[PDB]
Design a protein around this motif. Structure first.
Motif, PDB file in Angstrom:
ATOM      1  N   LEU C 306       0.895  -1.208   0.159  1.00  0.00           N
ATOM      2  CA  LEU C 306      -0.209  -0.070   0.195  1.00  0.00           C
ATOM      3  C   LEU C 306       0.926   1.143   0.043  1.00  0.00           C
ATOM      4  CD1 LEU C 306      -2.708  -1.424   2.472  1.00  0.00           C
ATOM      5  CD2 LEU C 306      -3.371  -0.112   0.296  1.00  0.00           C
ATOM      6  N   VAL C 308       1.329   5.067   1.461  1.00  0.00           N
ATOM      7  CA  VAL C 308       0.960   6.107   2.605  1.00  0.00           C
ATOM      8  C   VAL C 308       1.802   7.516   2.515  1.00  0.00           C
ATOM      9  CG1 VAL C 308       0.403   4.302   4.151  1.00  0.00           C
ATOM     10  CG2 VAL C 308       2.676   5.277   3.921  1.00  0.00           C
TER      11      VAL C 308
ATOM     12  N   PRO D   4       5.385  14.111  -0.028  1.00  0.00           N
ATOM     13  CA  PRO D   4       6.095  12.675  -0.457  1.00  0.00           C
ATOM     14  C   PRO D   4       5.184  11.392  -0.124  1.00  0.00           C
ATOM     15  CG  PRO D   4       7.690  14.015   0.734  1.00  0.00           C
ATOM     16  CD  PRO D   4       6.637  14.804   0.468  1.00  0.00           C
ATOM     17  N   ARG D   5       5.659  10.285  -0.734  1.00  0.00           N
ATOM     18  CA  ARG D   5       4.880   8.980  -0.684  1.00  0.00           C
ATOM     19  C   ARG D   5       5.770   7.779  -0.221  1.00  0.00           C
ATOM     20  NH1 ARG D   5       1.180   6.845  -5.646  1.00  0.00           N
ATOM     21  NH2 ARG D   5       3.173   6.192  -6.260  1.00  0.00           N
ATOM     22  N   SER D   6       5.213   6.917   0.576  1.00  0.00           N
ATOM     23  CA  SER D   6       5.961   5.749   0.979  1.00  0.00           C
ATOM     24  C   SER D   6       5.219   4.520   0.758  1.00  0.00           C
ATOM     25  CB  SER D   6       6.563   6.066   1.999  1.00  0.00           C
ATOM     26  OG  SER D   6       7.712   7.069   2.075  1.00  0.00           O
ATOM     27  N   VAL D   7       5.829   3.427   0.798  1.00  0.00           N
ATOM     28  CA  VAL D   7       5.219   2.151   0.704  1.00  0.00           C
ATOM     29  C   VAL D   7       5.351   1.043   1.982  1.00  0.00           C
ATOM     30  CG1 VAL D   7       4.396   1.888  -1.751  1.00  0.00           C
ATOM     31  CG2 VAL D   7       6.648   1.156  -0.909  1.00  0.00           C
ATOM     32  N   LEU D   8       4.582   0.531   2.593  1.00  0.00           N
ATOM     33  CA  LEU D   8       4.846  -0.565   3.637  1.00  0.00           C
ATOM     34  C   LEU D   8       5.734  -1.682   3.056  1.00  0.00           C
ATOM     35  CD1 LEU D   8       2.051   1.393   4.355  1.00  0.00           C
ATOM     36  CD2 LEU D   8       1.692  -0.640   6.071  1.00  0.00           C
ATOM     37  N   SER D   9       6.543  -2.032   3.970  1.00  0.00           N
ATOM     38  CA  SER D   9       7.236  -3.271   3.764  1.00  0.00           C
ATOM     39  C   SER D   9       6.535  -4.539   3.813  1.00  0.00           C
ATOM     40  CB  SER D   9       8.223  -3.666   5.073  1.00  0.00           C
ATOM     41  OG  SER D   9       8.803  -4.732   4.888  1.00  0.00           O
ATOM     42  N   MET D  13       2.872  -5.914   5.533  1.00  0.00           N
ATOM     43  CA  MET D  13       1.573  -6.682   5.155  1.00  0.00           C
ATOM     44  C   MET D  13       1.313  -7.857   5.554  1.00  0.00           C
ATOM     45  SD  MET D  13       0.291  -4.698   3.060  1.00  0.00           S
ATOM     46  CE  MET D  13       0.384  -3.060   2.168  1.00  0.00           C
ATOM     47  N   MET D  14       2.236  -8.432   6.148  1.00  0.00           N
ATOM     48  CA  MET D  14       1.995  -9.706   6.667  1.00  0.00           C
ATOM     49  C   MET D  14       1.319  -9.595   8.169  1.00  0.00           C
ATOM     50  SD  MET D  14       2.433 -12.480   5.344  1.00  0.00           S
ATOM     51  CE  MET D  14       2.893 -11.999   3.490  1.00  0.00           C
ATOM     52  N   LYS D  17      -2.454  -7.945   7.568  1.00  0.00           N
ATOM     53  CA  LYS D  17      -3.290  -8.990   7.223  1.00  0.00           C
ATOM     54  C   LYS D  17      -3.684  -9.777   8.429  1.00  0.00           C
ATOM     55  CE  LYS D  17      -2.184  -9.432   2.376  1.00  0.00           C
ATOM     56  NZ  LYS D  17      -3.864  -9.203   1.987  1.00  0.00           N
ATOM     57  N   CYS D  20      -5.791  -7.809  10.575  1.00  0.00           N
ATOM     58  CA  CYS D  20      -7.211  -7.817  10.072  1.00  0.00           C
ATOM     59  C   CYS D  20      -7.819  -9.197  10.335  1.00  0.00           C
ATOM     60  CB  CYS D  20      -7.297  -7.643   8.474  1.00  0.00           C
ATOM     61  SG  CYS D  20      -8.714  -7.164   8.145  1.00  0.00           S
ATOM     62  N   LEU D  85       0.905   4.642  12.484  1.00  0.00           N
ATOM     63  CA  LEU D  85      -0.156   4.865  11.622  1.00  0.00           C
ATOM     64  C   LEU D  85      -1.506   4.634  11.874  1.00  0.00           C
ATOM     65  CD1 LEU D  85       1.195   5.215   8.509  1.00  0.00           C
ATOM     66  CD2 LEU D  85       2.753   4.036  10.134  1.00  0.00           C
ATOM     67  N   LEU D  91      -2.295   0.664  25.108  1.00  0.00           N
ATOM     68  CA  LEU D  91      -3.110   0.778  25.977  1.00  0.00           C
ATOM     69  C   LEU D  91      -2.650   2.007  26.708  1.00  0.00           C
ATOM     70  CD1 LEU D  91      -4.276  -2.828  26.886  1.00  0.00           C
ATOM     71  CD2 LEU D  91      -5.688  -1.211  25.877  1.00  0.00           C
ATOM     72  N   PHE D 105      -8.573  -2.894   7.813  1.00  0.00           N
ATOM     73  CA  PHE D 105      -9.305  -3.371   6.973  1.00  0.00           C
ATOM     74  C   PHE D 105      -8.553  -2.863   5.603  1.00  0.00           C
ATOM     75  CE2 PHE D 105     -12.949  -4.134   9.750  1.00  0.00           C
ATOM     76  CZ  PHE D 105     -13.717  -5.124   9.258  1.00  0.00           C
ATOM     77  N   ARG D 106      -8.041  -2.037   5.355  1.00  0.00           N
ATOM     78  CA  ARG D 106      -7.531  -1.579   4.017  1.00  0.00           C
ATOM     79  C   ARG D 106      -6.337  -2.819   3.548  1.00  0.00           C
ATOM     80  NH1 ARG D 106      -4.051   3.583   1.401  1.00  0.00           N
ATOM     81  NH2 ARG D 106      -2.204   3.034   2.726  1.00  0.00           N
ATOM     82  N   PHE D 107      -5.771  -3.445   4.555  1.00  0.00           N
ATOM     83  CA  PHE D 107      -4.907  -4.576   4.141  1.00  0.00           C
ATOM     84  C   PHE D 107      -5.666  -5.681   3.391  1.00  0.00           C
ATOM     85  CE2 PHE D 107      -2.934  -3.043   8.328  1.00  0.00           C
ATOM     86  CZ  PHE D 107      -1.785  -2.681   7.728  1.00  0.00           C
TER      87      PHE D 107
END
Ligand SMILES: Nc1ncnc2c1ncn2[C@@H]1O[C@H](COP(=O)(O)OP(=O)(O)OP(=O)(O)O)[C@@H](O)[C@H]1O
Ligand SMILES: [Mg+2]
Lengths: 246, 233, 431, 133, 198, 147, 35, 49
Positions: C306, C308, D4-9, D13-14, D17, D20, D85, D91, D105-107
């Motif tokens: 994704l 961000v 600027p923009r960046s992507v998750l590793s 993602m693991m 997911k 979720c 993020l 807590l 949920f985006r994952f």
């Protein structure tokens, strides 16, 4: 039970004091001398050894005790000489253990009168070793010299049975002191430290400290979490009722 | 929930009152100036007892105040405290902070310091109505009681074999006379309290240890010379 | 302090499946045994049967049985008694730890509220009887046999039983949570009704237990305060007070839990509904869930990431590095402490003046500071005069007051020597 | 973009997911939404390929427990970043326990639509939702 | 409501880029004619807008604008390395008067590298790369790479304008005066700058 | 929040550091929870966001030797008296009679639970005496070795 | 000064508090001219 | 303030702050000169308007 005691107070490279060890009394130790002798300096050095929190330490004159003077200076920097200085306490524990707690103080170079403090503790030191000598190296003819923390660690580690520790946070320093029966309360949070310093500060200037009498409730009565939990429960109930009403 | 709250506050207040009232008998008529004894007065505040009663029995009657979207819970409690018991006449402090204060049980007890000045009975101790020595003695009494309470509270966490060290200070001791200093000494020794006192003149010649400090200018710097002192020669 | 006690005790416990099953069989037979005795001749048979059921033969039956019995005996699970006539020439009995371990699993299920009611009634009767006996009073032996033997043991045991019932309810709550969790895995959209019922019954059961608890908590507290009042009838009843202080908390503690559990459960309940309202509403068929699971399993067959926003951080200027002061200070080390002694001349003078002055108090003679000071200062040289005057005054003012001081007539400055020394004081009359 | 923009590793993602899954998983309902990193790692290893997932942590891993601890630490670090993020909240007093948020949920955006995975991936990358690696 | 002139400044089509560059820490000097004029005109309102973020919009005596984060800054803060400030002071020194005859406003990475090596003390260089290093090829190569990286970081800040090409040759802006020391009456700028650097 | 503190204190007393304090504490608490020794409840407001309670098996085990090993005969007498009162009351209630609900609440709820519990308590006292007999045998055996 | 210091020059006033006729009273004595 | 600062002794805070108010008298000459300057400015402004 035999309560622990403060045997002595040692001052190194202080303003006026090069290496002086006052042997404290079981009940009362008195210091006399004309104005400017340096008694208040000794009190300040002790308390610095006890609570090395730099935010709390504020050595106002006995006059204007608690009256804001706007000096912007806590007064500790001018009480130390250039180079390394030490302030240490020997305590006999109720377990009859001689423990030397202490702090290394050092002026920070710059226009700001800022100081750096590093606590430390020594356990198992032989009763025949005096801190005054332990902290100084005899260099030259009867011309002892002070040695830094690293040199002190090297010297102590070379000895047998003495355990030296250096603390990275005053929190662990207070925890260890409490473990050895030196502090009545466990200063886990910064508020506890503030209250402790308030107590000793009121004692030093003596008499009715306004903050003390104003927070006597906080100072005497203990905190309860059951009341907080009950109030939070009532808060949640009220929030749900408001949600439903809206 | 409101009833349970009020109940737990009442129980905690009663327990703390009992503890403090038992502790009060740990004082033995200190002699400072015209002050002959020091005491701690703990009393549930009627202005807050009424509030507890309303919370425990008449929560619903004031729901109009509680369920207002403008007021938070702390502000709601503050407004309710305002509603009943309206003669207290709190100051300019905001509703939010006064409510937050109301959320602490300790606030509900008036905790004050009484002194048996001369023969006027026990009167509330105000710095504005006490001599310098009297105030100093009263403050020392308060501090010793506070340290005793701290020691007592930590009795559980600490090991059974350790008694924490006890030590206090008093600069400018010359403000105290001989009688006051003797009383302070007897109190401290009875409580095993160590004291470090300072005064330009040796005000305690026949008790504990004493030192005298003299500052000498010496080759464009300073040195302090320390000499021990002894009672008799 | 108990850590060292536990460390030196050296206790620790171990029950494999076979040993545990043998222990449970022993407990069952003891329960069904007539007179509550177990000879080893039956223990060996029980171990043979359990080992046969478990289908494992490490060694012979006899050696395994002997090793297990010895291990349990040394593990504080069985007690052995040598009786030759007994079958096997030994008699074995379960030890308290063994009883506890066995009944931890084996107890009849006890969530019925009729039980809690009957223990509460029994407690009420015994507590009222003990309170009345204490109130009536008696000698030390009567006080004992009426307030220490009957009360202590009975109340402790039955409060522990009530607490045990609460713990069994806690176990049932846990079991129903697990049952709901397992059911939602198997039916998904079709278990919603089942879960709502289970939540309903559990909530109702919790509420009924709370109601039964509060049905007698107040009166029991009243009776306990009554026993507190009657306890002071003797000086040796200190121990009673402890119970009258201890048996308080437990009771209240129990009641607290009776609400706290509900406070917890009524919370957890909501979450379940939220889950049903959130997890399954948008995944009615659950297909999204399986598809997510397979994506996780086969993600790296199509690794995607994704995007961000990653706005830059505001770089700042580092504050100047702090450099301490190092000068290698050296200096002479202090010598041994000298000493000085205090002069008691003033003490001697004060004693002299007090003895010379006590006569005035003894005779109640009117003292005039002027004349007394003038006479007495003649005995000393001029430089010391002041140090005398002060002291004398200090000694004189403790002796009564001067009545003229209320007349509104100021006193004069009487000279008390040459060189110009003066004193202002009225005559001291009222001693 | 002016920002600027960046992507998750891929490890991110693991963990997302998995997060979720935990949000949607009823087995852990007893937790009531409060989860510990240990449980997250256990679930991750349960559903993923232990050693082949470990391959990314270190190229020379073969089940060594030192590398196992390294993977645990990496999972903890990724969890902290996701906390940054907003996908997860620690807590009010505990940083070792957390509560999941619906953002996770985006994952699953690659599987929320019942179509062929290879067409949905192209749709998303075209929309800018997800770049490849 | 909102101040009217503040709304005008925010609405201006230049605002997005300038805001992004400020929140990135970039310094806006006199060279950026449009941005500098915009900030000059609308400073009285952008100071309040960025004070709402617990940040201060500062116009330096040289003239360039920048953002200084407070302790309560709402913009994620960050701190430059030790090598970054050292290199900044090196460039500030190189904003010299003989510089005009030396490089005519265009320097190369080699100049900065040689100045840093000759001028800085060995201990700080090792602290930059690593303590155990001592005058080696790999350590020097890593030092050069870090020098290039910090030069890029300064470029991000607007301190250094690269001459457009992959090769490392650039120019130094007036904003570099931030690294510089205060000027007293009669003080030699060279002497004070070197005294600070030492 | 207090369980972790207790585990830290016990581990400190035992002087062993296999791993960090937190990991050991977490592993032990989880093991006891799964070993049916503790019950956990999720409450966010609670210190540590969880509340733990001893399970019946845990209660029984703990009390294996940290209960009073009661041998005083005054105890046995007081349980016998309590049993006598409750049994007589239940017998009289049964003799008086009543409907099914009365029969239940007078002969099944009060009798069953109380009598079972207190007979188990008396048996437990006998077992504690058995433990004391064993201990005195061991003490005699050890003494004869030394004198 | 609470009796600690004894300035020889000027006037000195010794004060002592007492109870007389059930009322607080300050007995006062005066000295001067010493030196 | 002066008297009480003497009574309690020490460097009084308020006195330290208002040193300039305390140790320096108020001069009417400067105020009169400033008033004259203001009058001149008023006349100049009137003429300009
Ligand atoms: N921070 C400081 N900076 C400069 N001089 C200081 C500082 N602290 C103390 N001094 C000086 O050191 C000497 C001793 O000061 P200190 O307050 O310790 O004396 P003291 O014995 O308590 O005096 P007194 O009893 O009159 O209050 C005095 O000259 C004081 O001016
Ligand atoms: Mg002083």
């Amino acid at each position: 039970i035999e309560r622990g005691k403060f045997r002595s107070l040692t001052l190194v490279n202080w303003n006026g004091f090069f290496a002086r060890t006052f042997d404290l009394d079981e009940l009362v130790t008195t210091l006399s001398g004309g104005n400017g002798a340096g008694k208040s300096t000794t009190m300040a050095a002790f308390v610095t050894a006890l609570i090395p929190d730099l935010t709390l330490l504020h050595f106002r004159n006995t006059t204007e005790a608690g009256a804001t003077s706007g000096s912007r200076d806590k007064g500790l920097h001018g009480k130390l000489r250039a180079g390394v200085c030490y302030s240490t306490l020997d305590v006999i524990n109720s377990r009859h253990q001689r423990v030397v707690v202490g702090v290394r103080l050092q002026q920070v170079a710059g226009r700001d009168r800022k100081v750096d403090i590093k606590p430390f503790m020594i356990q198992g030191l032989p009763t025949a070793i005096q801190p005054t000598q332990l902290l100084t190296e005899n260099v030259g003819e009867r011309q002892a010299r002070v040695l830094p923390l690293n040199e002190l660690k090297d010297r102590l580690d070379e000895m047998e049975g003495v355990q030296f520790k250096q603390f990275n946070s005053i929190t662990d320093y207070h925890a260890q002191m409490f473990d050895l029966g030196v502090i009545p309360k466990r200063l886990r949070s910064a508020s506890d430290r503030s209250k402790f310093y308030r107590l000793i500060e009121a004692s030093l200037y003596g008499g009715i400290s306004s903050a003390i009498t104003r927070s006597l409730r906080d100072y005497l009565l203990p905190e309860n979490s059951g009341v907080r939990k009950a109030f939070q429960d009532m808060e949640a109930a009220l929030r749900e009722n408001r949600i439903t009403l809206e | 929930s409101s009833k349970s709250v009020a109940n737990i506050i009442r129980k905690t207040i009663q327990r703390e009152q009992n503890r403090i009232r038992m502790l009060n008998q740990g004082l033995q008529a200190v002699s400072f100036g015209q002050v002959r004894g020091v005491r701690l007065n703990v009393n549930v505040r009627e202005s807050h007892a009424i509030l507890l009663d309303v919370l425990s029995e008449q929560q619903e009657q004031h729901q109009d105040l509680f369920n207002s979207q403008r007021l938070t819970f702390s502000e709601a409690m503050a407004k309710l405290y305002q509603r009943l018991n309206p003669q207290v006449d709190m100051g300019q402090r905001l509703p939010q902070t006064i409510g937050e204060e109301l959320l602490d049980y300790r606030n509900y007890l008036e905790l004050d310091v009484e002194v048996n000045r001369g023969s006027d009975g026990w009167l509330k101790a105000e710095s504005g109505a006490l001599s310098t020595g009297e105030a100093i003695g009263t403050g020392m009494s308060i501090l010793v009681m506070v340290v005793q309470s701290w020691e007592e509270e930590s009795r559980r966490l600490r090991g059974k074999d350790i008694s924490p060290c006890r030590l206090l200070f008093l600069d400018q001791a010359a403000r105290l006379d001989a009688k006051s200093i003797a009383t302070l000494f007897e109190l401290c020794e009875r409580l095993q309290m160590q004291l470090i006192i300072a005064a330009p003149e040796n005000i305690s010649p026949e008790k504990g240890t004493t030192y005298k400090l003299v500052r000498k200018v010496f080759k464009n710097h300073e040195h302090v010379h320390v000499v021990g002192l002894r009672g008799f020669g | 302090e108990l850590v060292s006690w536990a460390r030196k005790n050296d206790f620790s416990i171990s029950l494999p499946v076979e040993r545990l099953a043998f222990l449970m069989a022993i407990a069952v037979l003891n329960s069904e045994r007539l007179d509550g005795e177990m000879s080893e001749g039956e223990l060996i048979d029980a171990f043979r049967e359990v080992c046969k059921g478990f289908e494992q033969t490490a060694e012979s039956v006899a050696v395994r049985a002997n090793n297990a019995i010895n291990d349990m005996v040394r593990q504080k699970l069985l007690n052995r008694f040598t009786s030759e006539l007994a079958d096997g020439n030994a008699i074995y009995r379960l030890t308290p730890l063994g009883i506890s371990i066995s009944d931890y699993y084996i107890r009849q299920r006890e969530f019925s509220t009729l039980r809690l009611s009957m223990q509460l009634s029994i407690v009420a009767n015994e507590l009222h009887r003990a309170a009345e006996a204490a109130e009536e009073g008696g000698d030390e032996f009567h006080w004992h046999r009426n307030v220490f033997a009957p009360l202590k043991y009975s109340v402790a045991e039955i409060f522990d039983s009530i607490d045990m019932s609460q713990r069994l309810m806690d176990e049932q709550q846990n079991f129903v949570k697990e049952d709901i969790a397992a059911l939602l895995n198997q039916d998904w959209q079709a278990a919603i009704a089942n879960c709502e019922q289970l939540l309903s019954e559990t909530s109702g059961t919790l509420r009924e237990l709370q109601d039964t608890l509060e049905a007698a908590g107040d009166k029991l507290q009243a009776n306990l305060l009554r026993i507190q009042d009657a306890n002071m009838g003797s000086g040796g009843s200190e121990l009673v007070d402890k119970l009258v202080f201890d048996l308080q908390s437990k009771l209240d503690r129990i009641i607290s839990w009776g609400q706290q559990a509900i406070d917890l459960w009524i919370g957890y309940d909501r979450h379940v509904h939220k889950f049903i309202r959130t997890a399954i509403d948008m995944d009615k068929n659950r297909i999204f869930s399986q598809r997510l699971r397979q994506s996780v399993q086969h993600y790296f067959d199509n690794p995607w990431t994704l995007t961000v926003a990653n706005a830059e951080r505001l770089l700042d200027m580092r504050d100047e590095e702090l450099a301490l002061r190092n000068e290698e200070v050296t200096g002479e080390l202090p010598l041994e402490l000298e000493y000085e002694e205090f002069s008691e001349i003033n003490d001697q003078l004060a004693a002299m003046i007090e003895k010379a002055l006590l006569v005035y108090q003894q005779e109640q003679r009117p003292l005039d500071l002027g004349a007394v000071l003038r006479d007495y200062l003649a005995q000393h040289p001029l430089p010391r005069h002041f140090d005398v005057a002060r002291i004398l005054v200090d000694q004189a003012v403790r002796l009564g007051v001067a009545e003229a001081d209320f007349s509104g007539l100021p006193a004069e400055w009487l000279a008390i020597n040459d060189y110009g020394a003066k004193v202002q004081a009225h005559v001291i009359d009222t001693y | 973009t002016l920002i600027p923009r960046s992507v998750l590793s891929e490890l991110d993602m693991m963990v997302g997911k998995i997060l979720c899954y935990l949000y949607l998983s009823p087995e852990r309902l007893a937790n009531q939404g409060i989860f510990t990193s240990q449980e997250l790692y256990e679930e991750l290893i349960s559903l993923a390929d232990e050693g082949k997932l470990m391959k990314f942590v270190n190229q020379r891993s073969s089940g060594s427990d030192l590398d196992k601890q390294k993977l645990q630490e990496k999972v903890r670090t990724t969890l902290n970043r996701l906390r940054r993020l907003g996908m997860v909240y620690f807590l009010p007093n505990n940083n070792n326990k957390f509560t999941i948020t619906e953002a996770v949920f985006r994952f699953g955006a690659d599987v929320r639509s019942g179509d062929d995975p290879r067409e949905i991936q192209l749709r998303m990358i075209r929309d800018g939702e997800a770049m490849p690696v | 409501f909102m101040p009217v002139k503040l709304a005008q400044a925010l609405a201006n089509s230049l605002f997005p880029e300038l805001d992004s560059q400020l929140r990135a820490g970039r310094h806006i000097g006199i060279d950026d004619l449009d941005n500098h004029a915009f900030l000059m005109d609308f400073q009285e309102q952008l100071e309040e807008f960025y004070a709402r973020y617990n940040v201060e919009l500062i116009r330096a005596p040289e003239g360039f604008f920048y953002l200084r984060p407070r302790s309560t800054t709402l913009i994620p803060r960050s701190v430059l390395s030790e090598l970054d400030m050292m290199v900044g002071k090196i460039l500030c020194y190189l904003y010299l008067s003989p510089e005009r005859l030396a490089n005519q406003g265009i320097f190369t990475s080699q100049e900065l590298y040689e100045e840093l090596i000759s001028l800085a003390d060995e201990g700080k260089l090792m602290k930059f790369v690593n303590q155990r290093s001592s005058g080696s090829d790999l350590d020097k190569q890593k030092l050069q790479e870090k020098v290039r990286t910090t030069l890029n970081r300064l470029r991000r800040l607007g301190m250094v304008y690269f001459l457009p090409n992959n090769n490392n040759k650039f120019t130094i802006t007036e904003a570099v005066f931030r690294f510089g020391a205060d000027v007293r009456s009669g003080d030699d700028p060279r002497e004070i700058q070197l005294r600070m650097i030492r």
